[PDB]
From a paper:
β2-microglobulin (β2m) and its truncated variant ΔΝ6 are co-deposited in amyloid fibrils in the joints, causing the disorder dialysis-related amyloidosis (DRA).
CryoEM images revealed that the gross morphology of β2m-V27M fibrils is very different to those of β2m-ΔN6 and β2m-D76N fibrils, with the dominant fibril form being thicker and less overtly twisted. Subsequent 3D classifications revealed that 69% of the fibril segments selected correspond to a new polymorph containing four protofilaments (i.e. four β2m-V27M monomers per layer of the amyloid structure). The cryoEM density was of sufficient quality to build an atomic model for residues 21–84 of each chain. The fibril has C2 symmetry, with all four subunits per molecular layer adopting a near-identical conformation, but is packed as a dimer of dimers, with the dimer formed from protofilaments #1 and #2 being identical to that formed by protofilaments #3 and #4.
Author numbering:
A (entry chain A), B (entry chain E), C (entry chain I), D (entry chain B), E (entry chain F), F (entry chain J), ...: 21 to 84
Amino acid sequence: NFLNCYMSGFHPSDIEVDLLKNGERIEKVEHSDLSFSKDWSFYLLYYTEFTPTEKDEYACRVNH
Amino acid sequence: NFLNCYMSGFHPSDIEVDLLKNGERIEKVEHSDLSFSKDWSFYLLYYTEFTPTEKDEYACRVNH
Amino acid sequence: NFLNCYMSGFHPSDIEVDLLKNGERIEKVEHSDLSFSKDWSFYLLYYTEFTPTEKDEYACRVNH
Amino acid sequence: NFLNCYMSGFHPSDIEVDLLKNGERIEKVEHSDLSFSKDWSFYLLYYTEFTPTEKDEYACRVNH
Amino acid sequence: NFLNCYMSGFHPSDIEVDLLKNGERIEKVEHSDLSFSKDWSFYLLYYTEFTPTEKDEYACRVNH
Amino acid sequence: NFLNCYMSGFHPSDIEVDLLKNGERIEKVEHSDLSFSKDWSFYLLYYTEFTPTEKDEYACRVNH
Amino acid sequence: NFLNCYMSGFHPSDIEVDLLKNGERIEKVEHSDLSFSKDWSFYLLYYTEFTPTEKDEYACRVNH
Amino acid sequence: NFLNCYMSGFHPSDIEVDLLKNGERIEKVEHSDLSFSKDWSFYLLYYTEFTPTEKDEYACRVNH
Amino acid sequence: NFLNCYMSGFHPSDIEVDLLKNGERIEKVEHSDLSFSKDWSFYLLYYTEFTPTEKDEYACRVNH
Amino acid sequence: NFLNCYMSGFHPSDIEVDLLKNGERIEKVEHSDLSFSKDWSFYLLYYTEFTPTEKDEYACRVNH
Amino acid sequence: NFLNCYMSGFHPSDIEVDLLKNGERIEKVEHSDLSFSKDWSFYLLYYTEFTPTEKDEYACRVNH
Amino acid sequence: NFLNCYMSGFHPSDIEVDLLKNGERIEKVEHSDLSFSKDWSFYLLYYTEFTPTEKDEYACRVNH
């Protein structure tokens, strides 16, 4: 029994990025850009008035 | 029994980034950029008034 | 029985970044950038008024 | 002079079972089943009345 | 002069079972089943009345 | 002069079971099952009445 | 700022002369001539009257 | 700021002369001539009257 | 700030001459000539009257 | 100056006999017969009356 | 100056006999017969009357 | 100056006989027969009357 109550945010999965995986007899390889990401900022605010009012209840029950 | 009550933030998983994994007889390889990320900042605020009011209850029960 | 009540922050997992894993007879390899990240700052604030008011209860019960 | 008087039972010969003999650059190979046999039972009897009356004379002669 | 008077039972010969003999650059090889056999039971009887009356004369002669 | 008067039972011969004989650059090899056999029981009887009456004369002669 | 005031003479660049780079299974390779040059003589004069009167002002300025 | 006021003479650059870089299984390799040059003579004069009158002012300035 | 006022003469750079870099299983390699140069003579004069009158002012200035 | 006055007998030259010279990924090779010759007998006589009468003069002159 | 006055007999030269010279990933090789010769008998006579009468003069002169 | 006055008999030269000279990843090699010769008998006579009458003069002169 798999129960997921709440999931959010950056969660990519099962991603494969490859270049010349089984390359044979290749010549010069230059300026290969395989960068996945640059910056990870969950809260990025400029001159912001951040006032969230949330009453949240997380209740997930597995009865057997 | 797998129960996930709350999950958030940066959590990528099962990611493979490779270059010339089984390369044979390759010539000069230059300027390969495989950087995954640069900066990890959960809270990044500039001139911000950060006033969040949250009443949150995390209650997940597994009854057997 | 796996129960996760609350998970957050930077937690990537199962990530493989490799270059020329089983390379044979390769020539000059120069300027390979495999940096994972630069800076880890959970709270990064500039001229910020940080006033969060949170009443949070973390209650997860496993009854057997 | 090759003389065979009596031959019986399980005697297979000159059998070759192979998979990917000279395989190269294969990413995944999973759940390969090359089992030759499971159980060798010459007499397997359930609720059996086994009463065979046999008189046998194995007489093979090589005269030179 | 080769003379075989009586041969029986389990006697397989000249059998070759192979997988990836000269394999190169294989990323994953999982759950390979090359089991030859499980159980060797010449007499396996359940609730059996085994009463065989046999008179056998194994007489093979090589005269030179 | 090769003379075999009586041969029986479990006697396999000249069998080769192999996996990745000359393997190179393999990342993972898991759960490889090359078991030849499990149990060797010549007489395996359950609730059996074993009463075989046999008179055997094994007489093989090489005359030179 | 790249400024070149005067450049002359023999200055070839970025030249690649190659033969059988990744050659395989070659029976014979004979009399391969890859000579780049023979003689470097800036002044080579025979029975010459060399009388050049030159006034040169090499003035190149980078103002920031 | 790169400033070159005067450059002359023999100055080749970035030259690659190669033969059978990754050669395999070659039976014979004979009389391979990869000579780059033979003689370096800046002034080579035979029965020469060398009388050059030159006034040169090499003045290159980088002002910051 | 890189400033070169005067450069001359024999100054080649970044030159790579190679033969059979990663060679394998070669039966014969004979009479390989990789000579770079033979003779370095800046002034080589035969029956020469060398009378050059030159006034040179090498003045290159870096002002910060 | 090459002078051959008398040449006779078995003298073959420059003969190449090969099988699978640069073979790759070949299966079983069996019963390869590359025998050059069996028997070398210059004089082989059976019940022979061998009576040769020869007056032979071998005179070859190289005058320089 | 090469002068050959008399040459005879078994003198083969420059003969190459090879099997799988640069073989890679070959399977079982069996019963390879590369025998050059069996028997060397210059005089082989059976019930022979060998009576050769020869007056032979070997005179080769190199005058310089 | 090379002068050969008389040459005879068994004199083969420059003969190469090889099997799997640079073999890689080969399986079982069995019953390889590379025998050069068996028996060397210059005079082999059976019931022979050997009566050769030869007056031979070997005179080769090199005059300089």
